[PDB]
Amino acid sequence: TNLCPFGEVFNATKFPSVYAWERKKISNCVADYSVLYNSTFFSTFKCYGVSATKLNDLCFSNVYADSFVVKGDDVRQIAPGQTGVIADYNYKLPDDFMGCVLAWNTRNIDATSTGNHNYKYRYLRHGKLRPFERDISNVPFSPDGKPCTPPALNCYWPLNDYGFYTTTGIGYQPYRVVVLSATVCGP
Amino acid sequence: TNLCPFGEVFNATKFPSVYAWERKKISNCVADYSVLYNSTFFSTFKCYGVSATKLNDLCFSNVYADSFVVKGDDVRQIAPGQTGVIADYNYKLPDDFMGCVLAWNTRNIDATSTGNHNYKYRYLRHGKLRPFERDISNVPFSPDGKPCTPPALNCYWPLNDYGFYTTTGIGYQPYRVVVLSTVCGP
Amino acid sequence: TNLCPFGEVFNATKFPSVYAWERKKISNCVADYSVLYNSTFFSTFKCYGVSATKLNDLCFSNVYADSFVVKGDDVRQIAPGQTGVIADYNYKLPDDFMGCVLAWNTRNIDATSTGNHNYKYRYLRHGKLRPFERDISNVPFSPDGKPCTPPALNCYWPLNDYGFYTTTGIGYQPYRVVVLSFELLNAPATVCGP
Amino acid sequence: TNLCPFGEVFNATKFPSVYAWERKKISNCVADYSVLYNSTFFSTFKCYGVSATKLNDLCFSNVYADSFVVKGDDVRQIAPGQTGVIADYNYKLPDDFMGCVLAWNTRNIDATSTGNHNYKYRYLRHGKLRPFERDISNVPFSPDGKPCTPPALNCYWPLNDYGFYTTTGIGYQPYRVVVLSFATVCGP
Amino acid sequence: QVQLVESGGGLVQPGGSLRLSCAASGFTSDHYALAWFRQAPGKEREGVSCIDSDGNPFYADSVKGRFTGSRDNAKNTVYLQMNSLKLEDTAVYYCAAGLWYGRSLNSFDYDYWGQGTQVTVSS
Amino acid sequence: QVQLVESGGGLVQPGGSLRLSCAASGFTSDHYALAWFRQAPGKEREGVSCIDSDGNPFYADSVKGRFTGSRDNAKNTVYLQMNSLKLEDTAVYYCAAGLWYGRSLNSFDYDYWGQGTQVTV
Amino acid sequence: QVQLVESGGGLVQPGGSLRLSCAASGFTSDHYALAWFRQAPGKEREGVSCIDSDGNPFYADSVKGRFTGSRDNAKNTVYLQMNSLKLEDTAVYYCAAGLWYGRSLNSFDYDYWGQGTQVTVSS
Amino acid sequence: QVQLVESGGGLVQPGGSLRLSCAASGFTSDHYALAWFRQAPGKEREGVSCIDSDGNPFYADSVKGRFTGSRDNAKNTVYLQMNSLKLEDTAVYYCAAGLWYGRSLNSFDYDYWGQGTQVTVSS
């Protein structure tokens, strides 16, 4: 009877960095995906292994929504078979994934003339991520594996920052991504 | 509550070569895929993009079954994203495929001590195949495209032969493949 | 004794399109490759399988220089193992290549505020190119291969044009490329170093 | 002048495993590589980035020869751009490599009906090898990095053994490899 | 490999109409969406229209009501009719497909790009 | 990339028991099928057992009723318990995976091979 | 991509001669050496003859003095003359290419394989 | 695989000096050339300095006499000394490696890019 709380994730005031992505579990509701693909709010709406039109004719146990933020040239890395720093170290999707990817430009809220460097992503890690694996540790990376703090030789900090100004192209502009993976049914 | 005509394809005495593969249309029936994987008749039973256990809870308009025969080393080419002569020129599957692949050894019925060369495959074509495209032409291939005489220079026949003996290993033995693409589950 | 006529190729006023690239044979001269690597006239100077420094201590029978013009983002395709329209249909390098690639920006001579579309490249062909193969034909491409004239359906022209304006970045800006090939199999060698 | 002591490396009675490969420095001699290419002693003689006929007219400071032994199916990994257990963890070649690879079958000398497991190769390491990098350590591998002795859980030995019998095909048979990398070694 | 070939571009006058075609040759997938992109000198290629996997098309807000795109089922050609042209519509138009069983109006999602057909609106 | 690590092989006498473990490394997908293979010296690589994509396991007819294998999905480790050993079960045992939903092959046409752990009787 | 096409196989009698052709429809991108392989039912693929890229030929121990192989310099065609045939030379013959300067008569060094033309010397 | 990690960037004041380090990880080749690039917000990535595989450096005209870069043979590290700084030198600096023998001051020839350490010049 009750409908799924989608606007709580889309009308959300604050979004986290990619490495600290968040997942909200959806259960015991009727999701009307018809209004979503027919809405121009999203510039990117990609569904893998299934067309969104047919989601209205399926039931599911639970639906998961991973919310995070990356720049444009790194939105394509949220995809099966894709490699790269965002896919290797921050958010990996399985090649047999079945779901949808949603994204839209947010230069209006995440870009400043001074530069909004609050958004960080991981560029160093010991081994890549499993699908849906989440490494939010912030211990200084080292090649030898032996823990070091200082900014001395062969010791680096693990997270790096996105630089979001207003002059950059859509490849460097912030996009807000929401990935979607018998209680949650169609109409 | 009509049943799908499955046994008519599996217990079939005659199977075609890969280049001339055949498709049996399934319609107006209830497909119970659960009973099939519980049978040891297939040595190879791989499903792509869906689990066979959940197929029992799905409806479809029509189901297509492509029957053909290749050797072992050429069974791996029957797969999405796979390349090779069988996939390039004989039977190409789409990378976004959703279905199952079935195979089993048939050395006992398709191999002879002299060599059973009735099974042929295409190794020359002008361009690769689209998904589910079927080229059963037997015109002497030429690079220039101009039709020529087959024993002439730069003029070859398009089909080659499988040699299926009893003395060869299981890599060279014939396997019988069936690919799966109102028709509901129970 | 006599010096190699390099400046005739580098200070040459006019350069051809990529698909119709031209090659000048160098013979019977002393080539000093040290001055070239030490000169900033080229912004891109990439040598494959050999260092330009040791060419100054080497002999060759004849040296070949392929001159042509492509845009910035497509200079990366002038390399062994590189794919793409320029490598597939206009200029293919062999994977066992041993030589050097030279390039430099020429927006001052090949870019206009209106657009210089005189430079064309091939984007359609029936089969990719062999190493050093050159197809300067201008026949309308067809999928079936059968020749067609009609610009009415399923028949397209093989050449497309570079649009070189002044406002675009160096990725769209014209670079004038000169590729250097060698040869030794001829028992007498003629192009030597100092 | 002095001739190069090649037979000392090729007619050698003892060859090391791949992970413990050895390199012999050659200096102060005239190598005539033409006589080698014309000899049937090697079944595989592949040269990368250079022709063997023209090597006879070239000078070098010192010549290096890496000797080791692997099976047929693993000979293909001794090549630029090649991956695999032997190439990743035992002997890595650079993509810009310039030299020659020599090999020949030695089932008559390195295979027994009982199984010759004396030849070992590395299948576990923390990170791949640099070109010409050599890890002859034999410390128990661990995924977590924490050193462990007990071989029961999540702790494995880094080396594995080749089982070389006479009944297996040439894909499983031992071959003896000699790799050559690169002014004392000149032509005539 | 994969090939996209645009055709139909040329010099037109304001208020007029144009038809652009682009055909896909090599496609080992089955459910790819097809879209049209335009780029002016010194600007980033904007998403003009994006047609679903054999279904409904989507246009950018800047061309809504003026442009119409569609696909062919038998062939692998998408058409885009450009009505009521303006002077800002001058650009080099590209077709792009991408292999994702969905739709997007962003340039960074399109694994496979076509070629440049010039569209000029002058007098 | 992906790596398969076998463990548990050793010398036994007939009638005994053995357990083999195998661990998978590269998880570029989630519904991978896992199987066990053996090959005697100079013989063709036989399919021993195949465990579904987190489902039911399947054994070859020659070892049915004698062997039992299964995996843990959380630990991504496959185990194979080998009861009632014989002398014909002597072979070099291999771990292999494969990227196909539910039931999968018994033939050798897989995608990822492990490393030969020897079992002797 | 690369493609090799064998031709010339057929039924012959002992003591005769045969010539087999193979065409290299692949890229000249490298300095590839080309070789000849045969395989009988239930046996391992033997390296028959190998002609390097530099023009030098090499034969297997079993056919030395009996077989002669060569390449076409202008085109990409390798020939194999088989003189003084026997019944043990019966096998399915393959063309193979390898991307090095030297030579090899081993099956595992041949990254690119041709098709199979059958040669029978029975009766 | 390949990994490039820049280090040494930070907030500085005009007239000072800086040293930047970047380390190479997964290079299966031997003589790859190494270079320094800088990218201001909304601007095209400028070539700062490029040191070939043989150790010889090449600088852009805008930093000649002001910048000094060099490589370490033993360690896979490239260094860039930045003397006589200005406020227009504020940019995100990148190291990039290219798989040839010579030099290239162009961004499009490298295939392997670093992650980028920020350099800010304030007062």
Author numbering:
A (entry chain D): 320 to 500, 508 to 513
B (entry chain A): 320 to 500, 509 to 513
C (entry chain B): 320 to 513
D (entry chain C): 320 to 501, 508 to 513
E (entry chain E), G (entry chain G), H (entry chain F): 1 to 123
F (entry chain H): 1 to 121
Can you quote the paper on this entry?
In this study, we report a newly identified Nb termed aSA3, which targets an RBD core epitope distinct from aRBD-2 and cross-reacts with SARS1, wild-type (WT) SARS2, and all major VOCs. Among them, a Nb named aSA3 tightly bound to the RBD of SARS1 and WT SARS2 with equilibrium dissociation constant (KD) values of 361 pM and 51.9 pM, respectively, was selected for further in-depth characterization. Competitive enzyme-linked immunosorbent assay (ELISA) revealed that aSA3 dose-dependently blocked the interaction between hACE2-Fc (extracellular domain of human ACE2 fused with human IgG1 Fc) and the RBD of SARS1 or WT SARS2.
The electron density signature is well defined and covers most interacting residues of SARS1 RBD and aSA3. Superposition of the structure onto the RBD of the WT SARS2 spike conformations resolved by cryo-electron microscopy (cryo-EM)26 indicates that aSA3 binds to an RBD core region on the inner side of the RBD, which is buried when the spike protein is in a closed state. Due to steric hindrance with adjacent RBDs, aSA3 can only bind to the “up” RBD but not to the “down” RBD. Although the footprint of aSA3 on the RBD does not overlap with that of ACE2, the extended FR2 region of aSA3 would clash with ACE2 when in complex with SARS1 RBD, explaining the ACE2–RBD blockage of aSA3. According to the structure, FR2, CDR2, and CDR3 of aSA3 are involved in binding SARS1 RBD and bury a surface area of 877.8 Å2. Overall, fourteen residues of SARS1 RBD, including L355, Y356, S358, F361, S362, T363, F364, K365, C366, V394, R395, I489, G490, and Y494, are closely contacted by aSA3. According to the amino acid sequence alignment, except for I489, all of the rest thirteen aSA3 contacting residues on SARS1 RBD are also present on SARS2 RBD. Since I489 of SARS1 RBD binds aSA3 through its main chain amide group, the counterpart residue V503 of SARS2 RBD should also bind aSA3. The counterpart SARS2 RBD residues closely bound by aSA3 are L368, Y369, S371, F374, S375, T376, F377, K378, C379, V407, R408, V503, G504, and Y508 according to the sequence alignment. By contrast, the mutations at S371 and S375 (corresponding to S358 and S362 of SARS1 RBD) in Omicron BA.1 and additional mutations at T376 and R408 (corresponding to T363 and R395 of SARS1 RBD) in both BA.2 and BA.5 overlap with aSA3 footprints, which should be the reason for the greatly deceased affinities of aSA3 to them.
